Amino acid sequence: EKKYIVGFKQTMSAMSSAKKKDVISQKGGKVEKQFKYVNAAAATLDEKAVKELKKDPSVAYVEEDHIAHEY
Amino acid sequence: AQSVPYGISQIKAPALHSQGYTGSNVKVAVIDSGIDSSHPDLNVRGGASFVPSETNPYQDGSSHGTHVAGTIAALNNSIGVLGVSPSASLYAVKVLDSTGSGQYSWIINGIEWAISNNMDVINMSLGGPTGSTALKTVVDKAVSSGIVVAAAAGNEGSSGSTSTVGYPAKYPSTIAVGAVNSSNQRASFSSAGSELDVMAPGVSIQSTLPGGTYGAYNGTCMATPHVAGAAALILSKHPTWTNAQVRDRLESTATYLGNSFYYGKGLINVQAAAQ
Numbered sequence: 001e002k003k004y005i006v007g008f009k010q011t012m013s014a015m016s017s018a019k020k021k022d023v024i025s026q027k028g029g030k031v032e033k034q035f036k037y038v039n040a041a042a043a044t045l046d047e048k049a050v051k052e053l054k055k056d057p058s059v060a061y062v063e064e065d066h067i068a069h070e071y
Numbered sequence: 072a073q074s075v076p077y078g079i080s081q082i083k084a085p086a087l088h089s090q091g092y093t094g095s096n097v098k099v100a101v102i103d104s105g106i107d108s109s110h111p112d113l114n115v116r117g118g119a120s121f122v123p124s125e126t127n128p129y130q131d132g133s134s135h136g137t138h139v140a141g142t143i144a145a146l147n148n149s150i151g152v153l154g155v156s157p158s159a160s161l162y163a164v165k166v167l168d169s170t171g172s173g174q175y176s177w178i179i180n181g182i183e184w185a186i187s188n189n190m191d192v193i194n195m196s197l198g199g200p201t202g203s204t205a206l207k208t209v210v211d212k213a214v215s216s217g218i219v220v221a222a223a224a225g226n227e228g229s230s231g232s233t234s235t236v237g238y239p240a241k242y243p244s245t246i247a248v249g250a251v252n253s254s255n256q257r258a259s260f261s262s263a264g265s266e267l268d269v270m271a272p273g274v275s276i277q278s279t280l281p282g283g284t285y286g287a288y289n290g291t292c293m294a295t296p297h298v299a300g301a302a303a304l305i306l307s308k309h310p311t312w313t314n315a316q317v318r319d320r321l322e323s324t325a326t327y328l329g330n331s332f333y334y335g336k337g338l339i340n341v342q343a344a345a346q
């Protein structure tokens with residue numbers, strides 16, 4: 001598993017508090033948070049989940065939850 | 072006795088204070104490692120923490136967020152230092168732990184908090200060399216909602232003609248802030264690129280540290296809070312100005328320093344900007 005941010009397509013499914021959770025949750029993925037202003041979610045994902053998600057009509061992207069540092 | 076750090080004079084903040092403008096009622100989110108609100112030279116009005124292992128935003132194990140907070144709004148009194156906008160309301164939005172590290176999702180949660188609680192100004196004295204779609208979206212949303220977002224340009228120095236400006240400072244919606252010394256020279260660590268917007272003092276910047284003490288640090292991160300505080304001053308004098316108007320004044324009235332690749336529009340002058 002890794003720390004990821006999963007983003008959703010404006011309306012081509014998944015945004016809804018529940019179908020969003022569902023979308024990730026049913027690919028092994030796990031959700032830590034659903035963003036209020038961003039159509040996205042912080043999640044924990046194996047490699048399989050990533051491939052499935054990226055190919056979901058509801059998913060616009062699957063990016064790594066990167067680590068910043070004090071500038 | 073109170074000392075006025077050189078950078079505070081360098082951007083001409085004291086002229087605003089003499090006019091009677093000090094950032095009163097302007098809400099400024101310090102999206103950082105927390106603020107030690109027990110410091111006698113600071114007032115902290117609220118905040119929240121999105122660091123899972125450190126959920127109290129009023130504790131700062133790094134010292135970074137407390138130091139940034141004091142450049143922005145260290146109280147005008149008889150002790151310690153003086154911030155650019157000493158009457159501003161500071162919010163501790165903790166997204167970095169005691170090592171000064173944070174996940175992008177935590178940072179996003181902090182930015183969303185700032186949006187939901189109607190912050191006027193966001194200071195992000197942080198960045199990384201990696202872009203994030205979710206991050207851009209959230210910073211763009213904060214700006215389209217009317218919030219001024221000042222971001223450290225980064226401390227990766229220069230690399231031929233390639234931009235070393237980090238994220239979220241690289242994104243157009245933010246004001247990317249580089250660092251100059253007290254001679255208005257670019258600090259050699261200050262990141263460079265066409266994304267740079269302005270410069271501010273970022274060398275040997277004295278400010279507040281947890282435990283009621285004081286100390287100097289260097290960085291585009293120390294430069295940034297000068298610009299966030301400048302924004303607070305400008306809005307306390309022009310409460311109808313939008314974030315785009317604040318930004319335009321800071322950049323259009325900046326003191327030219329040279330090639331914009333290394334200096335952006337140059338050194339902020341809050342006195343000129345708030346005319």
Ligand SMILES: [Ca+2]
Nearest residue numbers: 146148150152
């Ligand atoms: Ca003071």
Ligand SMILES: [Ca+2]
Nearest residue numbers: 240242245247
């Ligand atoms: Ca920018």
